[PDB]
Design brief:
The structure is cut from a larger assembly and holds two copies of chain A (about 50 residues). Chain A is mostly loops and about 50 residues long. Chain A contains one helix and no strands. Helix content of chain A is about 10%, strand content about 0%. At the A-B interface, loops of A face loops of B. Chain B: It comes from Severe acute respiratory syndrome coronavirus 2. Chain B: This is Spike protein S1.
């Protein structure tokens, strides 16, 4: 179940290795948009939270 | 500048690899940004450059 916009989930993720390739190369999604950083190099660039 | 829209000014959004100095490029081949082969004019991860 996914809650609607009344109470939007704010899941916290840290202390793990993130493989964005699976979500990046999956046909089970409708739209995938972001210009803040090129989605190709998401995996190499690290993050904190 | 024209109020009706002088959108003949076109530019490259992205390229497969960076070009050497003073290397003009005119190709308009559709670039593929995913594992799937780029088929047809348009497709998933297939955008006009």
């Amino acid at each position: 179940r996914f809650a609607s916009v009344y109470a939007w989930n704010r899941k916290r993720i840290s202390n793990c290795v993130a493989d964005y390739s699976v979500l990046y190369n999956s046909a089970s999604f409708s739209t995938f948009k972001c210009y803040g950083v090129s989605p190709t190099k998401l995996n190499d660039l690290c993050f904190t939270n | 500048s024209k109020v009706g829209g002088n959108y003949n000014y076109r530019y490259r959004l992205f390229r497969k690899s960076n070009l050497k100095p003073f290397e003009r490029d005119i190709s308009t081949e559709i670039y593929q940004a995913g594992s799937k082969p780029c088929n047809g004019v348009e497709g998933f991860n297939c955008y006009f450059p």
